[PDB]
Design a protein around this ligand. Structure first.
Ligand SMILES: CCN(Cc1cccnc1)C(=O)CN(c1ccc(OC)nc1)S(=O)(=O)c1ccccc1C
Ligand SMILES: CCCCCCCC/C=C\CCCCCCCC(=O)O
Length: 504
């Protein structure tokens, strides 16, 4: 009997902290197994839960459950008894299942980051399907099972002689080069390469969702306006020395290939030869390229219905203008995010924008006028069209903008929460696996710990990094409960049906 030999040896390495590691493993085992079963049940029960991101998350809870059941109990025994009580066959299988599950975890988290990046950042904004997500999951298991074959090849149960003897399970390499090169590759494949890729991907996602599209709900509101829009526009034109008329506005830098003021100026030259041009009013707000400023200043001197503002304006002033002008012109060549369109439409201004980038996303047929980018003759026709629309009431058109900009910002706020939760998961994944991955390279790649000063401290750190790996699987369901309202509700429904029979 192996266990009798352990009782005969137990005096040599008595661990008085065994209860703590045991209670910590019992706690993680129940929470990891319970929380991850609900994650599967929540996505498999609710069809509105079956998103690409959640199908990958189910795959994480599947690898999480698979090791919680097959690997955690054996790891608890080994770290406490320093002995392999299971067979030589399980000495290959358990280490294989543990490493495979670490690979399936990392590649799945990397696939979630790619799927978010192609959907949020790439200009095509691909919408992945569930069949595409399932084929990647099948590939992830196949690739993970194949790369971990060499790991099963080298595990070997052997008898150690400290005259009562161990049986231990460990890697057995022929030669001192292969393990060092292998664990360098194990480090890059499981942790360093996937974690770098995710940092680069979520940094672009954060900067776009939080800054480049993060409009201020509370500031850009129509509630800050007073009176009727007619009274504001009339006071607006009176300040600039102009008669009441249909008002167009351009706000942006004076650029060569970017914001398109050169297109607007070319458009104003086209319209200026028509009698209808005397009905329109143009506010052009910006500065930059001196020759464009001199072109806009020259049109302003020529026409009593053009007004150029080169001085800096406060957000409240621009908000007042969005609430008073009839239309806002955005003739950008390049506009990934379209933040000025969301701000204008939130205050009722009607956008006349290039059909590119975020303007093409934001502006619909019912909530603005799109035009081919860089085309002055297209933009002149649109400004002529907007004037024809202005002979009738525009209130239903303005209310469609406000609702469309609100619904679009409502979508950005929903994408922020999902990306924020995914970022917490990868952050906690780097925290949990960092100790074991660093301790594995110091031990296997650099030879540390061989000449031990304090072996008890080193064996204690290894036991901690191990528990921390299983703790990560207990942590993720708790992350979904606190950062996703759809998981938080479906979790509550699973407890009521299980403990009460209540529907939800
Ligand atoms: C190369 C594997 N490795 C390093 C490592 C880096 C990153 C992620 N996982 C493991 C190890 O520490 C080694 N192994 C290990 C140990 C404890 C543990 O606790 C979660 N997890 C894995 S092992 O080879 O799989 C092994 C060996 C002996 C008994 C059981 C097991 C599972
Ligand atoms: C399109 C499915 C991709 C599946 C993951 C493959 C990642 C590459 C792994 C290399 C080791």
């Amino acid at each position: 009997e192996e266990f009798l030999r352990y009782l005969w040896r137990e005096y040599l390495h008595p661990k008085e902290y065994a209860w703590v590691l045991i209670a910590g493993y019992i706690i993680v085992f129940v929470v990891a197994l319970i929380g991850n079963v609900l994650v599967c049940v929540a996505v498999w029960k609710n069809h509105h839960m079956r998103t690409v991101t959640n199908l990958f998350i189910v795959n994480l809870s599947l690898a999480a459950v698979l090791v919680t059941i097959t690997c955690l109990p054996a790891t608890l025994v080994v770290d406490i008894t320093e002995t392999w009580f299971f067979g030589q066959s399980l000495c290959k299988v358990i280490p294989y299942l543990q490493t495979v599950s670490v690979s399936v975890s990392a590649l799945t988290l990397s696939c979630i980051a790619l799927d978010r990046w192609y959907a949020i950042c790439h200009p095509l904004m691909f919408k992945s399907t569930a069949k595409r997500a399932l084929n990647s999951i099948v590939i992830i298991w196949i690739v993970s099972c194949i790369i971990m074959i060499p790991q099963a090849i080298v595990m070997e149960c052997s008898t150690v002689f400290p005259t009562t003897a161990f049986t231990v399970c460990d890697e057995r390499w022929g030669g001192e080069i292969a393990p060092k090169m292998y664990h360098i590759c194990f480090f890059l494949v499981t942790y360093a390469a996937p974690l770098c890729l995710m940092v680069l991907l979520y940094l672009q996602i954060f900067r776009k969702l939080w800054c480049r599209q993060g409009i201020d709900c509370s500031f850009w509101n129509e509630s800050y306006l007073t009176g009727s829009r007619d009274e504001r526009k009339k006071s607006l034109l009176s300040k600039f020395g102009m008669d009441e008329g249909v008002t167009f506005m351009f706000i942006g830098r004076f650029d060569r290939g970017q914001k398109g003021v050169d297109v607007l100026l070319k458009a104003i030259e086209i319209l200026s030869s028509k009698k209808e041009f005397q009905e329109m009013r143009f506010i052009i707000i910006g500065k930059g390229d001196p020759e464009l400023e001199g072109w806009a200043r020259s049109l302003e001197e020529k026409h009593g219905n053009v007004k150029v503002i080169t001085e800096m304006l406060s957000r409240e002033f621009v908000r007042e203008l969005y609430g008073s002008v009839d239309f806002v012109i955005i003739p950008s060549y390049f506009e990934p995010f379209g933040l000025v369109a969301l701000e204008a439409m939130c205050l009722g201004a009607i956008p006349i924008a290039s059909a590119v980038g975020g303007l093409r996303d934001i502006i619909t047929n019912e909530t603005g006028i799109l035009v081919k980018a860089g085309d002055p003759g297209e933009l002149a026709n649109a400004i002529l069209k907007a004037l024809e629309l202005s002979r009738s009431d525009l209130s239903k058109f303005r209310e469609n903008c406000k609702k469309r900009a609100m619904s679009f910002s409502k979508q950005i706020r929903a994408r922020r929460k999902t990306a924020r939760m995914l970022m917490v998961v990868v952050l906690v994944f780097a925290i949990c696996y960092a100790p074991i991955s660093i301790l594995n390279v110091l031990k296997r790649v650099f030879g540390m710990f061989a000449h031990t000063e304090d072996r008890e401290t080193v064996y204690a750190w290894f036991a901690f990094s191990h528990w921390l790996v299983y703790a990560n699987s207990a942590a993720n369901p708790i992350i979904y409960n606190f950062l996703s309202g759809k998981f938080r509700e479906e979790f509550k429904a699973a407890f009521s049906w299980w403990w009460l029979g209540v529907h939800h």
